[PDB]
């Protein structure tokens, strides 16, 4: 059993008030069953698109989630992952730069 790594980053340079895309890349996990949500101010974002799950040379799974977002200095964004390898859901906050 392998624990997911989570990276959160934007498609375009983050500029407050300009629409952009936020990515959540989840990697290095096994087994493949996983639950991934993206959060705006701690609340689940509805329209989140998911890539097909695939796996690497080392057999560990990966998947990309993304969503439209507009950064501002009043909103937080995060990616939350539930997986059997972890007792509780793991949440990674967008660091506002990536």
């Amino acid at each position: 059993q392998k624990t997911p790594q989570i990276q959160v980053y934007s498609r375009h340079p983050p500029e407050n008030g300009k629409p952009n895309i936020l990515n959540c890349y989840v990697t290095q996990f096994h087994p493949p069953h996983i639950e991934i949500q993206m959060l705006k101010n701690g609340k689940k974002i509805p329209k989140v698109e998911m890539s097909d799950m695939s796996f690497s040379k080392d057999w560990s799974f990966y998947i990309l989630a993304h969503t439209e977002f507009t950064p501002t200095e009043t909103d937080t964004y995060a990616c939350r992952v539930k997986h059997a390898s972890m007792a509780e859901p793991k949440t990674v906050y967008w660091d506002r730069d990536m």
Binding site: K2, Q7, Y9, S10, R11, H12, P13, P14, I21, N23, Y25, H30, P31, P32, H33, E49, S51, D52, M53, S54, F55, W59, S60, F61, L64, H66, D97, M98
Partner: protein, 263 residues
Amino acid sequence: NYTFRCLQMSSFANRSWSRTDSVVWLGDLQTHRWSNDSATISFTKPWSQGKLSNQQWEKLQHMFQVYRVSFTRDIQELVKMMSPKEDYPIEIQLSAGCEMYSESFLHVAFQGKYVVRFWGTSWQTVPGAPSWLDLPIKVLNADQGTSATVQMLLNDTCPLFVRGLLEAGKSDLEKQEKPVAWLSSVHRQLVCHVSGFYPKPVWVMWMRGDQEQQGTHRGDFLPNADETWYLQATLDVEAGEEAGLACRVKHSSLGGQDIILYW
């Protein structure tokens, strides 16, 4: 060099529940998906049929349709025979294809670990694989018709199909997408973010004038959802001495005009 990979992931939860899902990659571009819920293989490019006629494609697809049902039954039968010693839940992964210059491969993993390959004219367990696999592999190897089909698929069908993809997909495979870069920081750490480049080869370096800063740490290549790449390169610097630094990006799409971003 292009590597063509067909990736199958099969999850067996209990005797009543299982699914098999596949994806196919040509290098870093996805060309097919085959969901458990679909009877047919889905194209993810307009050129995913390669140079095969509709007839040729239906036949090849048929061979995979028969395979998917046969595989699922074989694993279920195997678990019943081995129970309770080997039992659910079970994950099986297969990675098969060819690398073009060609050489082909077919590797199988059980519970996340490489255990079996097809090589030459037969299936084999790899050294270190659980010994309970030896008997089922021996039995599979008695199936001459399956061996002949697999040898054909790996030695012949795969490189032929991929040569057709390379010609049919030429304009996508040789696409050039330009990076956009930006700088950030929170004794400091400066981060140069580079996003939207294709293809993957890229050069990103912190500079002071013409001097490459050797403390530059390049991150992992991360995918964007639009078949482009993201990378960041970081440099830990002394506070006050940030002025004069710049991030330089070289990429094939830029036509010799590098991005230079001054801090």
